[PDB]
RNA sequence: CGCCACACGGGGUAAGAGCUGAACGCAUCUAAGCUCGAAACCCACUUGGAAAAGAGACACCGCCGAGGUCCCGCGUACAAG
RNA sequence: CGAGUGGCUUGCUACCUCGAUGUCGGUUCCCUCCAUCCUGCCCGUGCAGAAGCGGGCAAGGGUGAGGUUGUUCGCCUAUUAAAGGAGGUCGUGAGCUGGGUUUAGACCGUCGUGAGACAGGUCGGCUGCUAUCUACUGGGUGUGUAGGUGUCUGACAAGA
RNA sequence: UGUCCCAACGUUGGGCCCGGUGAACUGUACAUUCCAGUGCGGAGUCUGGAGACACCCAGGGGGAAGCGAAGACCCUAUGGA
RNA sequence: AGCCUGUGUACCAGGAGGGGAACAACCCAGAGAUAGGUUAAGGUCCCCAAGUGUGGAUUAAGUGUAAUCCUCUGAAGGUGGUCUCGAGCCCUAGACAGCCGGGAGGUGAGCUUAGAAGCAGCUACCCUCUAAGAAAAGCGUAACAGCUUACCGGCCGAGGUU
C-alpha cells in the first residue's frame, strides 16, 4: 500500500532476469523501484525444462528450510534478491526499497527498460511467470 | 470373501492348536496359515471365525497325522459381535477340515456352529447338526 | 578381460621372442581370404582405415575378420573377391595376476599395433561392394572408430 | 534383511502442538449448490448411548432389520448470527471488507466482546453492495455465537464465537438471505441447517493428555524381550543415523499429545430432537442431564464432555443422504455400571 | 519467402494479429497462425504467408500454414466429412448421439456406456450402421472421427479376434 | 482385544494411442498446432501457520479509562509457565 | 568381439586417524536411490481366452510370518497382490543385545625336542559418563510490527 | 506363563515445583545453523547458497569423528621382562 | 590409482601480493616504507571494479556460461536436428513425386506334373502390335482369378537426384 517509487517498471513481455539485473543496479544506486505486472513477465527457454527447475526449487528443503515463492509475485523478488548482497546492510536496504506487484496498482503506466523486451512475433519458446506459477500450484489471484 | 454378517476378533494365531469338529479321523489341528491374510512386521498371523486356514494334523489317526490340509474356523472362545450389539463366544476353538471346493472332508460335524459360517460355506453348513 | 587394459600404445615395444616365453598362440585363422589364387586384378579396392593409434588383440582381429569374411558369403563360399588383413599381433602383452611386489606380469596374449590412418583390412571386388557392409560389421568389433575407404573406384 | 514396515503415526497432523482456539475453525466449506443457507452450526458434547435402527442402507442384505448403533449426544440449542461479514477478492487472497451488525444482543455476549453501541448497518450494507457491483465481492459469512446459558450441564456462560460461511444460489440472493437472518436477531436452529439422515463433518479440539511418551504419542513399540529389562522400556532405538548429523523432525519423540483440532468427516446425523429422551439414568457421567434441543451423531466425536463441537455439511461425502432413519429404541440405561 | 493464396469467390477471410478467420456458406473457422518471423495477411483478394528467413524450419511452417488455410477455404465452402462404420460380432453395439457427445452402449457386453465429447461445430449424423462426421473445421472434425474410433480401442485382448468397434471408412 | 471416520472429481504430463501437418507435391503422431493418457505431478481434503521486516485484514470498545495482571472457587487444561 | 555406467562384492594403493573415529550379526527408529518384486498406465508376442513371457513409463504405497544357523548369505515351510534390491561411518553400542570375532582358564585334533603354534574345532569368560554446545520434539518469557476485545486472512509448510 | 502377538491399567520410590545444603566431569578461541562444495581424501568456523528476533523449561540422546585412557592390535627400537 | 620407482627442469616446502568460488606447488607475480600513475593474469548483465560494446555467423540443447584438474566425465555405436562447402547425373524436347489412363496379344511359352497358366522345380527367354508392356521384379491362389513393380501416355510445373 502506497510506495514512493522513484521508478515504476513494467515487466510485461520483458525478460525477467534482464529486468531484475537493472532493477538491482538501480536500487543499489539508491532508487526506489516497483515492478508491475509480474504475472506477465517472461523467461525464454523450453517450457518443460524451465518448469522442472522451478519445481525442483519448491521441492528442495529440510527442517532448516528452503522457502521458494510460487507466486509470480515472489518469484520476481527472489530473482532480484539473488542479484543483491542482501545480507549486508547496504544490500538489504536496496532490496527493501524495491517492490514487485501483480498487475498495476498505480495510475501511471510503468516504463519499459531498454533491452528487456521480447518480440512475441519472432519468438515462441518462452514462458510467462504466471504460467509457471499455475504449474507450481499457486492460486491464480490475478 | 462374502461379509460374515458379524465382527470378529481373531482368537487364533499361527501355531495355535484347536479342535477338529468332524469325524475325519483328525482330532487336533495346528494353524499354519490364514487364507488371504497378510499381517505386518512382527505381527503373528491371526485367524478367527469363518476364516479358511491351512492346517497340519497334530493328533489323530496315523494316516491323517502330519498332513497339511485346509479347513474353516467354526468356533472360537474369543467373543464376536452380532448386528444387534450382542456378543457371542463358544466353549472352544474348533474348525472343520475342508477340500479344494470347500466341501467337508468328513461326513459329520461334531458340536455347534456359528450361523455366520453358513453365509460363506454352504456345504459345511448344510452338514451341521446345531447352528447357533 | 577388457580392451581397456591393453588398447593404448603406452608401453615400450615388447616383441623379442628370444627373451619372452609362454606366448599364447594367435587366434587369427587366415590373413588371405577369397580367391588367393588370383592377384589384385579387380576394378574396385576398398579399405578399412583405423582412425586412432591403438593396440588390437588377436582376439579382436579374428572376431573382426571372421565377422566380415563370414559375411562376405553374400558372394558365395568360392566367390570372386580377395580379402586381406595386413596386420599381425606382434606386441606381446602381460598381466600381473604378491600385490604390486614383483608385478612384471605374465604373457597373456598378443596385440597388433595400428597407427591412426593405416588400413587394417583390404578387400578387392568388382562393382559389387557388399564388402562395404562386411566392414560396418568389422570395425564394429575393434576398439577404434574407422573410415571405410575406397581407392580404385570411380564407378559411383 | 530388515522387514519393511510403515512409519509410526502420521505426519499429516503436525506439528503436534496445543491448539490455539479451543473452538474449532473450519478451513474448508461446502459447495454453493442448493438454496442460500448457513453452512454450519455448533453445540456441546454430552455423552454416549446406543440406539436401535432400521437398516436404512439399500445395498445391505439386512436393509429393513434391527441394528444397534452407538451415538454421541450433543446439546445443540439455538445460536445467533449477530453479524454478516463480507470479504473482497484481492491480489493477496480474500480480505474482510466490512460488517453488518444488529442491536439485539444476548444478555451475556459482553463477557467476550465489547458489544457495539454505535454501528452504521446501512453504510456497511452499502459498501458491500458497491463491492458486489464492482464484482470484488468474495464469499459471505456470519459471525455467530452460542448460548452456553441455555445449557445447564455446561458451567460457562461466556459465549463461544465463530464465523460460518453462507452458501446459496446467486451471490445477490444469498447476500440478502444473510442480511435477513442477521437483522432479525440472528437466532437459528440445527433444524434450519441440518436434517436427520444427512452427513456432517464434526470439528473439535480433542481430549488433552499433556505430554506423553512416543509409544503412546506415536505408536512406536516398547522395548521387547531382554531389551525391556535393561533400563530402557519405552524409548525408541535411535534418533537417527550418524549422517545426517542432526535429529530429523520426522522422528517420533515425546510431546504435547491431545488438545489438537480435528475435523472428523462424514458423520451421520441419526436424529435431531428436543427434550430428555436421549438422557441416561443417573445422568451422563461428569456432564449432567439433557433436556432441550439435541442431536444424535453416529459413532464418536472428538473432544471431551462439555466441549464445543462444530457441524458442517460434509464437503466430501461418500454416500447419498437417506433421510430420517427410523429409530425404534434409544437406551436410557445408566452409564454407571 | 512469400506465398500468395487467392481466396475463393465463395469466401471471405479476415485477420487481426495472429488470428485468421475464414467465412463461407458452410460456416466460419478461426485459427491462430503464430511462428517466429512468419507474417500472415489478407491482401484484399489474396492471403499472404511471408518471412525473411529461409532455413528449413521456417519453410516447414510456411508450408503448414498454407495447407492449413486452404483446408479452411475448403471447409467453409464444400466442407469436411469422414465416413464411419459401426461393426460388431456378438454384441449388438448401439451408437447414439446424445447432447454434444456420441455414446456407445453394450460394447463387448459392457454394462457401462462408452462416450466422447464432439469437437466444435461438427455434425455426427448416424444412419444405421453408418456414421458421417462433418464440419467446416477440419481439425475438430478429424478429431471427432478419430476419437470415435479410439473410443472402442482395446488393449487387453487380441485385436485380430476382437474386432468390434467403429472405424473411419472414408477420409476426405 | 472395543467402537466411529479416512472420496470422488477436476488440471497438466511420462510411456503410449491418435488428429491436422510441412520440410520432402507423396507419406509422416512433430518440426509449428492439437485430442487423449499412469497408483506418479498440481488442485481438491486434513493440520500448522502475523516474526510473512511488504511484520496483514475487519468490526466494535477505549485513550481517564477499554481491557488486563494479582486475588478467590475450580477444571473441558496442565511437569514450571 | 568391442564401448561403457555404478561404487553393493573382491583386490590394489598406503592419502587420513595409532596422546583410540568402539568389532561382526541382530534389534529399534528415521530419511533416501531405481537398475521396479507387487500395485497403476502402456508396447510386443511363438497375443483365441485364462494363465504367461519379454519390454516401456513410473519410487505414491507395499514388500509380511516362521524351521536349522551367531551368521550376512542361504536352505526349507505355509501364507501372499508381491513376499525387489541398495545408500545413509558395510546408517543406527554417550540406544539395546553380546550369539560370533579377539585377552587371561580348559579340552581335542594336527605340528613342534620344547616353551608353544593354528586363517582348526570346543566349553567358560566385563559393555563406563549427572549433556557445555549444536540438533530436533514439545512447553514458556520478552522485544519488534505500534491502547484493547473478538473474528479472520494465507505467504508458505506437513501428509500416504 | 506378558518372552511374543501388543500393548493397558494400577502400586511404591524418584522424576517435576518450593525451602535448606551443595559438589564433579569438561573448557585454544569464536559459536543460531542447514544443504552442497572445497580442504592432509570424515568441516558449527573455508567457499557458494539457504535459513536464522533474543532469553528460558522439560525431553530422548542425531552430531561435536562428544567425555573418559600418550592404542591392548600392527610395525619400528642394535627396548624390558 | 590422489599407485610404486627413475630423469631433466621449474616451483611448494621455506614464496608474499593479484586471479582461479574456496584450494602448498595452475595463470600473473618474485616483495623495504609511504605516495601518485600505468599495466599483468584475469575480467567488463547483476551480485562486483569495468561493455547489457561493434561487424558477422552458428546453436534451441539451458547444449553451454567448466584453461589445467582426484576435482571439469562421457564412449563404441547412432542421427532426413540444422548450417556450410564440393562432385557426378537428370531436367521447360517437361525432370523428382504424386494422381488418372495404359500395362496388349502368339500364349494358359516348353518341360516336368493329375495339375502349374509371370511367379513349386528345370530350360529357355524367342516376335507381333505399338506410344508403351518381362517367356515377369513383389504379393496372392489348390491351381486360376485378383492386386501391384518394371515399361508408355496424360494432368501438373521447377528444379531434382546421387
Ligand atoms: Cl522446507
Ligand atoms: Cl549477501
Ligand atoms: Cl522462439
Ligand atoms: Cl503364515
Ligand atoms: Cl526392542
Ligand atoms: Cl625472489
Ligand atoms: Cl536453467
Ligand atoms: K588408529
Ligand atoms: Mg521381528
Ligand atoms: Mg544390560
Ligand atoms: Mg459405563
Ligand atoms: Mg452393563
Ligand atoms: Mg489373455
Ligand atoms: Mg563416537
Ligand atoms: Mg526407470
Ligand atoms: Mg519415497
Ligand atoms: Mg524368530
Ligand atoms: Mg555400520
Ligand atoms: Mg539397515
Ligand atoms: Mg557403549
Ligand atoms: Mg551412538
Ligand atoms: Mg550413558
Ligand atoms: Mg560371547
Ligand atoms: Mg557359545
Ligand atoms: Mg565361546
Ligand atoms: Mg529490533
Ligand atoms: Mg555462509
Ligand atoms: Mg601411543
Ligand atoms: Mg602382541
Ligand atoms: Mg629380553
Ligand atoms: Mg620442512
Ligand atoms: Mg559496476
Ligand atoms: Mg549442463
Ligand atoms: Mg578437460
Ligand atoms: Na531463460
Ligand atoms: Na522449497
Ligand atoms: Na610376498
Ligand atoms: Na569401433
Ligand atoms: Na541400566
Ligand atoms: Na532394570
Ligand atoms: Na556411532
Ligand atoms: Na490425470
Ligand atoms: Na504482527
Ligand atoms: Na566404472
Ligand atoms: Na574399494
Ligand atoms: Na588421535
Ligand atoms: Na550392530
Ligand atoms: Na514406488
Ligand atoms: Na532363517
Ligand atoms: Na553392534
Ligand atoms: Na555397549
Ligand atoms: Na507385567
Ligand atoms: Na547428542
Ligand atoms: Na623458489
Ligand atoms: Na583465490
Ligand atoms: Na544449464
PDB file of C-alpha atoms in Angstrom, chain C residues 51-135:
ATOM      1  CA  UNK C  51      41.426 -43.547 -37.084  1.00  0.00           C
ATOM      2  CA  UNK C  52      43.496 -43.640 -33.843  1.00  0.00           C
ATOM      3  CA  UNK C  53      46.728 -45.385 -32.853  1.00  0.00           C
ATOM      4  CA  UNK C  54      45.681 -48.359 -30.755  1.00  0.00           C
ATOM      5  CA  UNK C  55      46.533 -51.912 -29.888  1.00  0.00           C
ATOM      6  CA  UNK C  56      44.378 -54.658 -31.271  1.00  0.00           C
ATOM      7  CA  UNK C  57      44.350 -58.021 -29.510  1.00  0.00           C
ATOM      8  CA  UNK C  58      44.496 -61.038 -31.783  1.00  0.00           C
ATOM      9  CA  UNK C  59      41.102 -61.611 -30.141  1.00  0.00           C
ATOM     10  CA  UNK C  60      39.721 -58.538 -31.825  1.00  0.00           C
ATOM     11  CA  UNK C  61      41.346 -59.247 -35.135  1.00  0.00           C
ATOM     12  CA  UNK C  62      39.932 -62.760 -35.501  1.00  0.00           C
ATOM     13  CA  UNK C  63      36.479 -61.566 -34.401  1.00  0.00           C
ATOM     14  CA  UNK C  64      36.675 -58.596 -36.751  1.00  0.00           C
ATOM     15  CA  UNK C  65      37.957 -60.675 -39.665  1.00  0.00           C
ATOM     16  CA  UNK C  66      35.524 -63.580 -39.312  1.00  0.00           C
ATOM     17  CA  UNK C  67      32.529 -61.252 -38.959  1.00  0.00           C
ATOM     18  CA  UNK C  68      33.397 -59.652 -42.329  1.00  0.00           C
ATOM     19  CA  UNK C  69      34.587 -62.651 -44.332  1.00  0.00           C
ATOM     20  CA  UNK C  70      31.910 -64.885 -42.823  1.00  0.00           C
ATOM     21  CA  UNK C  71      29.572 -62.150 -44.048  1.00  0.00           C
ATOM     22  CA  UNK C  72      31.267 -61.793 -47.419  1.00  0.00           C
ATOM     23  CA  UNK C  73      29.341 -65.058 -48.054  1.00  0.00           C
ATOM     24  CA  UNK C  74      26.693 -62.923 -49.684  1.00  0.00           C
ATOM     25  CA  UNK C  75      29.009 -63.675 -52.606  1.00  0.00           C
ATOM     26  CA  UNK C  76      29.460 -67.439 -52.146  1.00  0.00           C
ATOM     27  CA  UNK C  77      31.968 -69.688 -50.352  1.00  0.00           C
ATOM     28  CA  UNK C  78      34.073 -69.551 -53.547  1.00  0.00           C
ATOM     29  CA  UNK C  79      33.019 -66.027 -54.590  1.00  0.00           C
ATOM     30  CA  UNK C  80      35.083 -63.638 -56.715  1.00  0.00           C
ATOM     31  CA  UNK C  81      36.931 -61.375 -54.271  1.00  0.00           C
ATOM     32  CA  UNK C  82      40.085 -61.245 -52.190  1.00  0.00           C
ATOM     33  CA  UNK C  83      40.194 -60.155 -48.568  1.00  0.00           C
ATOM     34  CA  UNK C  84      43.334 -59.100 -46.652  1.00  0.00           C
ATOM     35  CA  UNK C  85      44.213 -58.257 -43.031  1.00  0.00           C
ATOM     36  CA  UNK C  86      47.682 -56.693 -43.301  1.00  0.00           C
ATOM     37  CA  UNK C  87      48.468 -56.549 -39.557  1.00  0.00           C
ATOM     38  CA  UNK C  88      49.960 -59.250 -37.331  1.00  0.00           C
ATOM     39  CA  UNK C  89      49.848 -59.324 -33.488  1.00  0.00           C
ATOM     40  CA  UNK C  90      53.500 -58.764 -32.726  1.00  0.00           C
ATOM     41  CA  UNK C  91      53.324 -56.870 -29.475  1.00  0.00           C
ATOM     42  CA  UNK C  92      53.251 -59.326 -26.591  1.00  0.00           C
ATOM     43  CA  UNK C  93      51.071 -58.455 -23.619  1.00  0.00           C
ATOM     44  CA  UNK C  94      51.193 -59.282 -19.923  1.00  0.00           C
ATOM     45  CA  UNK C  95      49.070 -59.145 -16.760  1.00  0.00           C
ATOM     46  CA  UNK C  96      50.010 -59.086 -13.091  1.00  0.00           C
ATOM     47  CA  UNK C  97      47.764 -61.911 -11.923  1.00  0.00           C
ATOM     48  CA  UNK C  98      52.116 -60.607  -4.047  1.00  0.00           C
ATOM     49  CA  UNK C  99      50.209 -57.438  -4.907  1.00  0.00           C
ATOM     50  CA  UNK C 100      52.455 -54.886  -6.569  1.00  0.00           C
ATOM     51  CA  UNK C 101      55.546 -56.725  -5.333  1.00  0.00           C
ATOM     52  CA  UNK C 102      57.349 -58.369  -8.279  1.00  0.00           C
ATOM     53  CA  UNK C 103      54.490 -57.141 -10.609  1.00  0.00           C
ATOM     54  CA  UNK C 104      56.090 -57.547 -14.032  1.00  0.00           C
ATOM     55  CA  UNK C 105      53.122 -59.559 -15.414  1.00  0.00           C
ATOM     56  CA  UNK C 106      52.991 -62.916 -17.224  1.00  0.00           C
ATOM     57  CA  UNK C 107      52.422 -63.166 -21.010  1.00  0.00           C
ATOM     58  CA  UNK C 108      48.712 -63.491 -21.536  1.00  0.00           C
ATOM     59  CA  UNK C 109      48.423 -62.543 -25.213  1.00  0.00           C
ATOM     60  CA  UNK C 110      49.496 -60.619 -28.286  1.00  0.00           C
ATOM     61  CA  UNK C 111      48.201 -57.467 -29.959  1.00  0.00           C
ATOM     62  CA  UNK C 112      48.970 -55.714 -33.209  1.00  0.00           C
ATOM     63  CA  UNK C 113      49.826 -52.011 -33.061  1.00  0.00           C
ATOM     64  CA  UNK C 114      47.930 -49.927 -35.573  1.00  0.00           C
ATOM     65  CA  UNK C 115      48.595 -46.270 -36.127  1.00  0.00           C
ATOM     66  CA  UNK C 116      45.803 -43.874 -36.936  1.00  0.00           C
ATOM     67  CA  UNK C 117      45.108 -43.814 -40.706  1.00  0.00           C
ATOM     68  CA  UNK C 118      46.657 -47.204 -41.553  1.00  0.00           C
ATOM     69  CA  UNK C 119      44.435 -49.665 -43.354  1.00  0.00           C
ATOM     70  CA  UNK C 120      43.992 -52.816 -41.290  1.00  0.00           C
ATOM     71  CA  UNK C 121      41.779 -54.535 -43.885  1.00  0.00           C
ATOM     72  CA  UNK C 122      41.767 -54.541 -47.686  1.00  0.00           C
ATOM     73  CA  UNK C 123      39.216 -56.160 -49.972  1.00  0.00           C
ATOM     74  CA  UNK C 124      39.146 -56.440 -53.730  1.00  0.00           C
ATOM     75  CA  UNK C 125      35.860 -56.557 -55.565  1.00  0.00           C
ATOM     76  CA  UNK C 126      34.260 -55.968 -58.974  1.00  0.00           C
ATOM     77  CA  UNK C 127      31.474 -53.362 -58.817  1.00  0.00           C
ATOM     78  CA  UNK C 128      29.795 -55.486 -56.124  1.00  0.00           C
ATOM     79  CA  UNK C 129      30.521 -53.684 -52.790  1.00  0.00           C
ATOM     80  CA  UNK C 130      28.785 -55.966 -50.299  1.00  0.00           C
ATOM     81  CA  UNK C 131      32.226 -55.514 -48.784  1.00  0.00           C
ATOM     82  CA  UNK C 132      31.298 -52.016 -47.640  1.00  0.00           C
ATOM     83  CA  UNK C 133      28.845 -53.841 -45.420  1.00  0.00           C
ATOM     84  CA  UNK C 134      31.312 -56.511 -44.319  1.00  0.00           C
ATOM     85  CA  UNK C 135      33.265 -53.679 -42.760  1.00  0.00           C
TER      86      UNK C 135
END
